[PDB]
Structures are given as structure tokens and as C-alpha cells.
Amino acid sequence: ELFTNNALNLVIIFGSCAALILMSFWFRRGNRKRKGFLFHAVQFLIYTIIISAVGSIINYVIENYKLKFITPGVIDFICTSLIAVILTIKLFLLINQFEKQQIKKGRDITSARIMSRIIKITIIVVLVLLYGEHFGMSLSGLLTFGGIGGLAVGMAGKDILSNFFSGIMLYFDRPFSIGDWIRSPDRNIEGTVAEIGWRITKITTFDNRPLYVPNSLFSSISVENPGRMTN
């Protein structure tokens, strides 16, 4: 209200004014006016700071002034819920722009819609699992639900992650190189190496055909390199 109320409020509204000035500057985005990824992250961060400052202000108001019946528990529940809502809106907008980019690149409409919906459901589940205390339920129930889900996801996704880990290993310690003829007594991977990727290795066979070998195979089989022979 007056100067006395501001003194009783310490310096909180000053933080809100500073955040408003920062948002006005970020409208020009400092060095270059644009948006994307980090812009939404910093906007969400400053919104969280503003909401926390407003919560502190209303808590001080209800403490020093008349208590009335506000029960600040629901006030922190409401501020957390608003933060969750704005985070969900930001994530939905981000995945919508991702779907727009995918459809611009040229892809099946139904497939892109289904993929967007998969990302939607995954985001909702993760946010429910993480935020499930300000409005959530049983600690045991959430722990069990998340444990079952995580066990299933970890068991099911082992092979793709294994391929990518072997790709990292190949990036750091690779027994062959591009253009080397390679072989294996365990599997049929014969040909000359054409490309080394993060998930698969592309090899040109001796009948001029591309062969795509998963990277994890190089972590469990013996690899011979006739391209480096001496005689």
C-alpha cells in the first residue's frame, strides 16, 4: 500500500519489477531478437521466480496484517499448480512446433500426429510422477507405479541403448577405419567399411550392396581386418 507497507514487505516487489524489465529486454532477446528452446526455459524460470515472489508477498501480507481465512497451504498448492500449468503449456507448444517441423520436412500426417501424441503422453506421465506430491497421493503407490514403469522401460529399451553405447565406444576406440576390408568368424559382416555411425555401421559388401551392422555386435564378436594384412 503505502511506504510503511513496502518497508514491511522488505524488497520483493523490486524483484518483480526487475523480472518485468528482464522480460521486456528479452522481448528484444538481447543480442538478437528470436525465440526457441532456451527462450522458453528462461521465460519459465522468470515466471517461477515471479510466482515465488508473489507467494512470499501474500504470505507476509496475511502474517503482518489480518489473517482472515486464506490458509497459505492452498496458496502454495495453487502457485505450484500454476507453475505446472505453464510448464505443460510450454512443453505442448514445443512439441507442436516439433510436429510442424516434421510435417514441413515431409512425412505421413498420421505418423507425425501419432508421434506427437506419444510425446504428449510421455510428458504427462513424467510430470505426474515428478510433481505428484503437491496434489499427489501415496508415497508407496507412486514409488511402486514408477518402479514398475521404469523396470519395464529399462528392460525393453536395452538393445537400442546398447547400440548407442557401442557407437560411443567405437568413436573413442575403433579397431578399423573407413575403407578397411573387415571380417568376422562369428557373424557375416564381410565387406569394406563405408560409414561409422552412432547406431549402425554401413559396410559395402563385395557384390556392391550396403549392409547395416548394429554397433553392439562389435562389442561381443572377434573382428578380423584383412585390410591391414602384411602378406
- Binding to ligand PTY, residues 48-107 (CB under 6 A): 94, 98
C-alpha–C-alpha distance, residues 213 and 209, integer Å: 13
The residue from 28, 100, 117, 187 that contacts a second copy (CB under 8 A) is 187
Strand residues in the chain grouped as ranges (E) = 181-182, 191-196, 200-204, 210-214
32 binds, among a second copy, ligand PTY, none (CB under 5 to 8 A by kind): none
C-alpha–C-alpha distance, residues 92 and 44, integer Å: 13
- Binding to ligand PTY, residues 130-149 (CB under 6 A): 148-149
C-alpha–C-alpha distance, residues 182 and 85, integer Å: 55
The distance of closest approach from Cβ of residue 46 to a second copy in the complex, given in angstroms and rounded to an integer, is 15
Check binding of 147 to a second copy (CB under 8 A): yes
- What 3-state class would DSSP assign to 197? coil
Residue 58, number of CB atoms within 10 A of its CB: 14
The binding track of 26-65 with respect to a second copy, each residue x by CB under 8 A or -, is ------------------------------x---x-----
Check binding of 165 to ligand PTY (CB under 6 A): yes
Check binding of 26 to ligand PTY (CB under 6 A): no
Reduced to 3 DSSP states, what percent helix, strand and coil does the chain have, rounded to the nearest 5?
65, 10, 30
Check binding of 173 to ligand PTY (CB under 6 A): yes
Asked if residues 223 and 210 have their Cβ atoms less than 8 Å apart, the reply is: no
The distance of closest approach from Cβ of residue 129 to ligand PTY in the complex, given in angstroms and rounded to an integer, is 8
Asked if residues 221 and 187 have their Cβ atoms less than 8 Å apart, the reply is: yes
Decide whether 28 or 199 has the Cβ nearer to ligand PTY: 199
Chain centroid to CA 124? 13
Check binding of 186 to a second copy (CB under 8 A): yes
Chain centroid to CA 25? 27
Provide the binding-site residues for ligand PTY, judged by CB under 6 A: 36-37, 94, 98, 114, 117-126, 128, 148-150, 152-154, 157, 160-161, 164-165, 168-169, 172-173, 197-200
